[PDB]
Amino acid sequence: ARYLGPKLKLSRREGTDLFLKSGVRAIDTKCKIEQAPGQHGARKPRLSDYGVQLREKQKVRRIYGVLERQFRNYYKEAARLKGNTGENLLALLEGRLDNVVYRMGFGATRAEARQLVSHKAIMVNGRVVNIASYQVSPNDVVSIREKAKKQSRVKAALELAEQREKPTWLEVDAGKMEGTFKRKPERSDLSADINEHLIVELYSK
Template sequence: MAKYLGPKLKISRREGTDLFLKSGVRAIDTKCKIEQMPGQHGLRKPRLSDYGIQLREKQKVRRIYGILEKQFRNYYKKASQIKGNTGENLLKLLESRLDNIVYRMGFGSTRAEARQLVNHKSITVNNNIVDIASYQTYPNDVIAISEKSKQQSRVKAAIEISDQREKPNWIEVNTDKMQGIFKRIPDRADLSMDINEHLIIELYSR
């Protein structure tokens, strides 16, 4: 499936929930009618089969993290090979991606912006430049804005925005130094997003 390049709020309306594709300073329901399907008059949401419900949940999570279909399936396969709950393992793998950690630390106002920072070699992991957005981070990794990128206006703006949001307790951030520590892999209880990972597991188990 090709990457979607259209209006961000349109796909949030398509899924009927906030996909965190905007900065989050303003509530999404002040920007659009999230309960209505996209279209001039707000199309009526179709009644979905069990398969349709499972598919929509998978699409929702895939879009939250900005991942293409093949890559998402690979994450599922990897999660299923790890001991424990496959659904929780899947979310932990997604949360440990470098672009997501950069977003969680507030260095990018959205995951897409965080991904750009990584791709443009603006992020270091343990003092080494890493330009792979899907790079898997581990506890005690130190993630920072590279010296050459610390004066970027978008980084400073993102940090100002992030100061208005509560940061997860599984990371530690020093905004003055523009760096943070990935303290631990989050538990499922740490992730408050409206996600039913069990539906995704049911979909891939068909």
Template sequence: MGRYLGPKCRLSRREKTDLQLKSGVRGVDSKCNLERTPGQHWSRRGRTTDYGLQLRMKQMIRRYYGVMEKPFRKYYQAADGQKGSTGDNLLKLLELRLDNLVYRMGFAATRAEARQLVSHKSILVNGSVVNVPSYQAAKDDVVEIRSKAKGQMRIKAAMDLAKQRTTVSWVNTDEKALKGTVLDLPEVAELPAEFKVNLVVELYSK
């Protein structure tokens, strides 16, 4: 199954929350009516089953990070094999993806744009080119824009937009050098409150 290329608002409306799929300074509710579910005349849904809730939560988190089904399951399996909370481990693994860090550091307006920057070899990790969006970063890793890409207007525009986004404590960005550092492991408490990751654990534990 290929990556979704359809309307971004449709996905946020389906999950009834901002999946941060679109760039811009306006709130997503000014672009997409989150109360209006996709479908002709709005979709009218009956009572959702436990399985339905679990599935929707998996889809919400998967789409938020732009990860396809098969890789997402592998992330879950890796998280389940680690010590501690499987749900928290899953979110930390997703947050430490290189494309997500490029977005968190403000070098891209969306995670999709961040994936493109990585794929086009515009990103260095600890001084070496890394062109794999799913590359798993670690504490103290330094992520920076490659010299030949620093003049791109979209990066400057993204940095301006990032000033109006909520920042997270585990990354630090040097705006002048276009360089960022992973200061610590992600804090799950700083992630969207809508993420009921225990539902994903219940889904995959069946």
């Protein structure tokens, strides 16, 4: 149910940075970011339309840490919902609870955030929520409980987050270690490099 393998490997394969490490050390220093993964990486065959779509999909999936069945389900729900399908899908992915904690900044990576959620460190509306796929809703306060409030990892994460760029759609208090999920983020607020449209087409062939 989780990918258990090299992370910079995933990034190398995609091409982009998927943010699977904390970013203390640059990824170019941590790995050959230029060279593609494997014996035969230094070769670029020209990629078909299917291939390109697949690569982008892989990128997004790796970034968030969603396996295929779950991703497909997300897409179906997004399609069902009114409005633009790709936009909707991105919103759902952001909405995921692990992603929200990462945005707030209690986890250095999404992996870290997921671990915290799993281990029951995070309460949504004063209730320890355990599911990483838990959809957070608008106006939902989500907070670190005091036992995990003493975590040096959590405090380290906060420092890292302070370094990172803060999201407009959340509001987070570092001392209280609580953030209010004010609204589901808009596509302009999310990254432009993600071409959700390719994902939609792929799951619509």
